[PDB]
Ligand binder design. Structure first.
Ligand SMILES: O=P(O)(O)O[C@H]1[C@@H](OP(=O)(O)O)[C@@H](OP(=O)(O)O)[C@@H](OP(=O)(O)O)[C@@H](OP(=O)(O)O)[C@H]1OP(=O)(O)O
Length: 332
């Protein structure tokens, strides 16, 4: 091991210990809460702070575990407004305009922060320009006209000549699970790389989006494609972490063919897996007892487990890089 240490075996070892120490610290706390069926918000646990700090490290690990994922943290311009935003962007996050301008041509996934909420994205950039497919894990808008302006603002961030599709999906119910959900969606995008790529071509050629999705419309101010029904592009595997049982149930009721496909290697269907994750606990409105799927909180724990294992045996430059990312979370 000394060969790759470059003579700082002590510093590398201590920084490795420090990173695994933090991950294991967060992991332990999250595991205690989940095992005891306890709401984090009622337990005074600050998931938002922990999610923001671990997220750059999760991206490093996921990129290494899946070569080609090419996951990049991005933020919209409003995320740079310290007066309105809930949190500053995660460490290493890049402004969209800056990314689009200077990034090497290729295929990217992204988690995109607007200052208070995070979405997932699949991005294709080449000589002809940039096309992006945005999937929002949250779908809370009463009037479905608010999504039209969402599609615009995203397309505006990438430039008006960029092709854009905006797909709001009813997955998130809590207020703080957008980051982990978007990370999961990014991974699924990589999983369905060819399906999203085909959609990119259609967007770039101005073809019929109905070859990829069930219901779509052009916004007609930027020409962005708003997708109010993403199936089959948004399949059962992307609905796995649905927090409300009714969201999963309603989805299957709307796309019955998705109810029998296996969503993991243990051959569970979406319904079987969701039912397995159902819990009943007190949360905050003072308190409310509800039934929902704790699938997301398990996912966060699984991701931390991955990240910790990766750091344990990661090469020294990676340890350095992840230690710095952890430290830089305190710069804003
Ligand atoms: O690579 P994938 O086929 O996409 O599935 C992997 C994972 O793989 P490994 O355990 O072998 O490392 C699990 O897969 P299973 O063993 O259960 O089949 C898991 O799935 P479950 O949570 O349902 O158990 C999870 O998937 P998910 O986040 O959708 O729940 C995860 O997926 P990712 O690679 O996207 O992180």
């Amino acid at each position: 091991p000394a060969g790759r240490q470059a003579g700082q075996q002590a510093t590398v070892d201590r920084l490795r210990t420090q990173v695994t120490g933090f991950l294991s610290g967060a992991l332990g706390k999250l595991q205690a809460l989940s095992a005891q069926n306890m709401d984090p918000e009622l337990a005074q646990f600050r998931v938002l702070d922990v999610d923001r700090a671990i997220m750059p490290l999760l991206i490093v690990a996921e990129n290494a575990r899946n070569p080609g994922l090419n996951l990049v943290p991005l933020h919209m311009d409003m995320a740079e407004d310290e007066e309105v935003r809930t949190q500053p962007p995660m460490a290493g996050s890049r402004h969209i305009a800056e990314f689009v301008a200077s990034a090497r041509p290729g295929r990217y996934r992204a988690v995109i922060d607007d200052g208070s909420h995070t979405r997932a994205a699949d991005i294709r950039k080449d000589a002809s320009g940039t096309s992006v497919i945005v999937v929002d894990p949250l779908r809370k808008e009463k009037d479905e006209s608010a999504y039209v302006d969402y599609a615009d603002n995203v397309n505006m961030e990438f430039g008006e000549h960029a092709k854009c599709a905006f797909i709001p999906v009813d997955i998130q119910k809590s207020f703080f699970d957008c980051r982990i959900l978007s990370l999961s969606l990014a991974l699924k995008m990589h999983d369905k790389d060819d399906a999203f790529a085909a959609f990119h071509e259609t967007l770039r050629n101005g073809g019929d989006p109905s070859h990829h999705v069930s219901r779509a419309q052009q916004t007609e101010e930027l020409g962005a494609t708003l997708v109010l029904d993403g199936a089959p592009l948004v399949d059962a595997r992307m609905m796995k972490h649905g927090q409300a049982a009714s969201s999963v149930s309603r989805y299957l009721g709307n796309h019955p063919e998705q109810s029998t496909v296996p969503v993991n290697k243990r051959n569970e269907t979406l319904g079987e897996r969701t039912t397995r994750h159902l819990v009943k606990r007190k949360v905050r409105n003072e308190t409310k007892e509800i039934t929902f799927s704790n699938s997301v909180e398990q996912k966060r724990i699984a991701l931390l487990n991955r990240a910790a294992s990766y750091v344990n045996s990661a090469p020294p430059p990676v340890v350095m890089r992840m230690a710095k990312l952890l430290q830089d979370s305190l710069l804003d």
